Design an enzyme around this catalytic site. Structure first.
Site, PDB file in Angstrom:
ATOM      1  N   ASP A 457     -51.314 -14.230  -6.315  1.00  0.00           N
ATOM      2  CA  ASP A 457     -52.538 -13.974  -5.572  1.00  0.00           C
ATOM      3  C   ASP A 457     -53.736 -14.328  -6.439  1.00  0.00           C
ATOM      4  OD1 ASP A 457     -53.993 -13.337  -3.355  1.00  0.00           O
ATOM      5  OD2 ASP A 457     -53.933 -11.163  -3.652  1.00  0.00           O
ATOM      6  N   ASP A 533     -56.291 -12.566   4.048  1.00  0.00           N
ATOM      7  CA  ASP A 533     -56.421 -11.170   4.462  1.00  0.00           C
ATOM      8  C   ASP A 533     -57.224 -11.138   5.757  1.00  0.00           C
ATOM      9  OD1 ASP A 533     -55.014 -10.409   2.204  1.00  0.00           O
ATOM     10  OD2 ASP A 533     -56.820  -9.975   1.033  1.00  0.00           O
TER      11      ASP A 533
END
Ligand SMILES: *[C@@H]1O[C@H](CO)[C@@H](O[C@@H]2O[C@H](CO)[C@@H](O[C@@H]3O[C@H](CO)[C@@H](O)[C@H](O[C@H]4O[C@H](CO)[C@@H](O)[C@H](O)[C@@H]4O)[C@@H]3O)[C@H](O)[C@H]2NC(C)=O)[C@H](O)[C@H]1NC(C)=O
Ligand code: CA
Ligand code: CA
Lengths: 859, 93
Positions: A457, A533
């Site tokens: 990430d 997200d």
């Protein structure tokens, strides 16, 4: 979203200076006397009429109907950046020969074939002809721009200044740009990772589409702004043709779409901050043809392990190691299938990776062994940014070797993360990648087990305090290249390094699974991606489909999104609807936030629990179908989740449909995307074609728009007439017990009474299918009233305990005698059941191994 | 596996719900003949069913039918992996 922290075309200097050029006559021209034709390539010199700057155009013809051209300076002060490691290998060359010659234009044949290229001198222009049919034009509107290397010393041509960050330009402006015009085509897709529809809209009354890897916090929908990923591939579709454009450049990109050689019905324009012009043209003539061409160019999707195809459970606030045990016991207590449990940044000892805090998790290896006792996997986060500490030996080892990204004055870039500070290593350096790969060893990584994996990430990279949310453009990387040259390859390098490390830790035997956020062209060979997200809204549920479709159109077949949203914890109805949506996607994982609550399938209300369990069972039953689809994508490059116009390239109505999609060429999925909708309209295409719904087996003829009512437990899925689908009808805890479970075949008959299907089988977690050729590829064909099985690939030998346990035939009359024939054995009789109302037939227990070919006859 | 004395000796195993009838040869043939799953008590073939594990300890209870031959012990006595191959030892105390 906060649009202040992101640049528009006005704030971006090179975009503003390049879009100021109106279409018209071009100053660049080609000198036909300085033209050299060789077997390898064609070289010509272009000149600028005003400033008198010499450029070099190099043209190559590549086999399987491709071409590639490059434009670069002839005398540069320093060489420009050419992108490495994106192409898997050097493409084969097709010989070009001069067909005809004229004073202004010269035409060359592509190869021993029909394609040809016309180059004009004044003005410079390239035209592609399929025999006498025009395909596309290059520099038709005279929008070519090449800012040459200025003197080593007007606003925006030098050191700029952001809101609070100063971005120096030591080498000055080096912008590049080009335009292409495709006559007869009005539909263009591609340039993924934009929260927009599947069809790209014109960008004349707004900002261009931006290809730039960025960490956009709380992004919204229907905007041309950039996102985490960037793949510079465009696909233009026609009822008779299909073409592809590949813009190989790693800098910030702005692309303009227009509609209108003065009448090209769709124009595309590329503008990049730096580099050379390196353009690949894919000449079709089919959508599968351009898919195979791009697969040959930048590799194919890597075959994932079988466990990654199941349901993944993730939650930010996994505080103790007993919480993982509670989650596992809840999964195994409420009869909910699950494969992988995920850990967020909390597991690391204060963001210190490659280690476990003793107070956080006492014994990680023993916990991994306990999880593997239930045949489940754990996945931890590893960011490409590390803490600056004198005890955390990663920083000291990387500092002594010297593998960091250098800042403006030659120091070490130390943009600070929330705990203390943070350093950024130079992943462009191959030695840094080798060190990163070697750090994933079992001896190096403490508490490491074979059932533990890593997901990456913030690999954009995402700097907390910097220009936008990314690194400064003046940072000096390995090889004397600026960060503005290699911005879009950072995520690809991180993903490749992590994949290499995870596959090397097992001696090159096991299949790794690395899931990364940022990527580029060619990342599909290293793992999977997700759509960042997303918040929990119905609009995001609607937009989840076009983003994955665009990602799969460029080879990123294993797309997905967070289940239940990231922000703004969802309502139970929206949660159930998203679970049904994600049960038919390549990637399936639930994520939450610190401010949110505990949303788990067992914590949901009792009525919704059965629906979630049914969705999980439907996902787990279709595992052989998903595995075969992923094997086909790995072997050919055709995406798993493809739109409707791919299978039907002549139906105009399918040209703008993103509500429903196709899983291969057998299943049509139109999930519910509304709150309490009483019914949905599903478009069924096909000239004389039938579709059978999964639930009621009702037959619907195409093409039409069927309005079917839905409830909370309705997932609208149709099987195409004339297909064969394998399934595992027994739910197991995970996807490892099902590896040796019997197969049930579902046959959807065509109106002519024919069907065909394929199946791929392996152990699912090794590379044995390539080295020792240990795999099973089976082909089932229903012709007339005989169903036979054979080997699609004869050189695939694999011993499996799986036996076919049930046959389901849809749309057939009752038989008088069903028999089974094998090799060197007498034929036996099989009991069958027929339902006259729904016209379904069930053949009970063939009891024959999959690896052995047979034949079933119906009387 | 059934915990009850429903004999397959003289009469064929008819049913428990009352809908479908089968011969006693089809019992425990790894195929779920009846919708109730009563024809595969000691087999994981039935999507809906149970498996009465037998033990001398303190936990007489049913398990879901998918827990049979899954490679993971779910009862006290190692009876669920009788055909899987994963050897287990009882902890009935
Ligand atoms: C590289 O380029 C060459 C040249 O374009 C290309 O060869 C071409 O392939 C296409 C597609 O396979 C051929 O087009 C076919 O031609 C036949 C004969 O006229 C037609 O019958 C076909 O129509 C059928 O298909 C329809 C749609 O599927 C169906 O509705 C129906 O069954 C039709 O009968 C189709 O138009 C074309 O003839 C060749 N041309 C040559 C010169 O070979 C080649 O495939 C390309 N290769 C790669 C790797 O890209
Ligand atoms: Ca039976
Ligand atoms: Ca068991």
């Amino acid at each position: 979203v906060d649009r202040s922290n992101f640049k528009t075309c006005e704030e971006s200097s090179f975009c503003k200076r390049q879009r100021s050029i109106r279409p018209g006559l071009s100053p660049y021209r080609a000198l036909l006397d300085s033209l050299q034709l060789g077997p390898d390539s064609l070289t010509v010199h272009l000149i600028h009429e005003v400033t008198k700057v010499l450029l070099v155009l190099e043209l190559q013809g590549l086999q399987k109907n491709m071409t590639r051209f490059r434009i670069d300076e002839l005398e540069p002060r320093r060489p420009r950046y050419r992108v490495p490691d994106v192409l898997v290998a050097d493409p084969p060359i097709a010989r070009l020969s001069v067909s005809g010659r004229d004073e202004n234009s010269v035409e060359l044949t592509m190869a021993e074939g029909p394609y040809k290229i016309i180059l004009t001198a004044r003005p410079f222009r390239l035209d592609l002809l399929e025999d006498r049919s025009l395909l596309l034009s290059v520099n038709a509107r005279g929008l070519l721009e090449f800012e040459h290397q200025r003197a080593p010393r007007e606003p925006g041509a030098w050191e700029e200044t952001f809101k609070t960050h100063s971005d120096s330009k030591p080498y000055g402006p080096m912008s590049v740009g080009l335009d292409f015009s495709l006559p007869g085509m009005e539909h263009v897709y591609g340039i993924p990772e934009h929260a927009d529809n599947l069809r790209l809209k014109v960008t004349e009354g707004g900002e261009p589409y931006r290809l730039y890897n960025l960490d956009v916090f709380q992004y919204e929908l229907y905007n041309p702004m950039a996102l985490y990923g960037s793949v510079p591939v465009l696909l233009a579709h026609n009822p008779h043709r299909d073409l592809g454009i590949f813009w190989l450049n790693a800098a910030e990109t702005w692309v303009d779409i227009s509609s209108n050689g003065e009448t090209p019905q769709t124009d595309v324009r590329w503008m990049s901050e730096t580099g050379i012009i390196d353009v690949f043209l894919l000449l079709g003539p089919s959508i599968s043809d351009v898919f195979r061409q791009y697969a040959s160019l930048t590799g194919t999707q890597a075959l994932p392990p079988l466990f990654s195809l199941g349901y993944h459970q993730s939650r930010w606030n996994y505080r103790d190691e007993a919480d993982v045990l509670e989650v596992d016991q809840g999964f195994d207590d409420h009869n909910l299938p699950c494969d992988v449990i995920w850990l967020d940044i909390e597991h690391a000892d204060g963001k210190r990776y490659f280690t476990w805090d003793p107070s956080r998790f006492p014994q990680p290896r023993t916990m991994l062994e306990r999880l593997a006792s239930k045949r489940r996997k754990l996945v931890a986060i590893v960011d490409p940014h590390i803490k600056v500490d004198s005890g955390y030996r990663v920083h000291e080892e990387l500092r002594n070797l010297g593998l960091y990204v250098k800042t403006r004055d030659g120091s070490d870039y130390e943009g600070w993360c929330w705990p203390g500070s943070a350093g950024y290593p130079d992943f462009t350096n191959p030695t840094m990648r080798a060190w990163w790969a070697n750090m994933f060893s079992y001896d190096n990584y403490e508490g490491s087990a074979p059932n533990l994996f890593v997901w990456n990430d913030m690999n954009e990279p995402s700097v907390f305090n910097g220009p936008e949310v990314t690194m400064l453009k003046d940072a000096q990387h390995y090889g004397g290249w600026e960060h503005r040259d290699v911005h879009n390859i950072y995520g690809l390098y991180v993903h490749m390094a992590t994949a290499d490390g995870l596959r090397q830790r097992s001696g090159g035997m096991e299949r790794p699974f690395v899931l990364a956020r940022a990527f580029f062209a060619g990342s599909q060979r290293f793992g999977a991606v997700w759509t960042g997200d997303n918040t929990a809204e119905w609009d995001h549920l609607k937009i989840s489909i076009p983003m994955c479709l665009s990602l799969g159109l460029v080879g990123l077949s294993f797309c997905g999104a967070d289940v239940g949203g990231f922000f703004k914890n969802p309502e139970p109805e929206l949660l159930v609807r998203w679970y049904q949506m994600g049960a038919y996607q390549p990637f399936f994982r639930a994520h939450a936030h610190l401010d949110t609550g505990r949303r788990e399938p067992w914590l949901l209300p009792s009525q919704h629990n059965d629906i979630i369990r049914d969705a999980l069972g439907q996902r787990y039953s279709l595992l052989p179908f998903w595995y075969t689809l992923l094997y086909q994508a790995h072997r050919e490059g055709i995406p798993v989740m493809r739109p409707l116009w791919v299978q039907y390239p002549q139906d105009v109505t399918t040209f703008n449909i993103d509500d429903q999609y196709l899983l291969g060429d057998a299943l049509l999925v139109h999930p519910v995307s509304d709150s309490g909708a009483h019914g949905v309209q599903v478009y069924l295409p096909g000239q004389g074609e039938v579709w059978y719904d999964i639930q009621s087996y009702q037959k619907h003829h195409g093409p039409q728009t069927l309005y079917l009512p839905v409830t909370l437990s309705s997932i609208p899925v149709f099987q195409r007439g004339g297909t064969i689908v394998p399934r595992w009808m027994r739910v197991r805890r995970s996807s490892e017990c099902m590896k040796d479970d019997p197969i049930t075949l579902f046959v959807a008959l065509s109106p002519q009474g024919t069907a065909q299907g394929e199946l791929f089988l392996d152990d699912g977690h090794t590379f044995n299918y390539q080295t020792r050729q240990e795999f099973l590829l089976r082909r089932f064909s229903f012709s007339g009233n005989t169903l036979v099985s054979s080997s699609a690939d004869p050189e695939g030998h694999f011993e499996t305990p799986i036996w076919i346990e049930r046959v389901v035939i849809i749309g057939a009359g009752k038989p008088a005698a069903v028999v089974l024939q094998t090799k060197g054995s007498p034929e036996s009789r099989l009991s069958f059941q027929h339902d006259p109302e729904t016209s379904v037939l069930v053949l009970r227990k063939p009891g024959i191994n999959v690896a052995s070919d047979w034949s079933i006859h119906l009387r | 596996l059934t915990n009850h004395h429903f004999y397959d000796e003289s009469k064929p195993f008819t049913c428990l719900d009352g809908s479908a009838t089968i011969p006693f040869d089809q019992v425990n043939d790894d195929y779920c003949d009846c919708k109730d799953g009563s024809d595969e008590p000691g087999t994981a073939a039935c999507p809906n069913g149970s498996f009465h594990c037998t033990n001398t300890g303190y936990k007489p209870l049913y398990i879901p039918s998918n827990r049979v031959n899954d490679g993971v012990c779910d009862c006290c006595d190692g009876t669920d992996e009788y055909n899987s191959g994963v050897i287990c030892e009882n902890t009935c105390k």
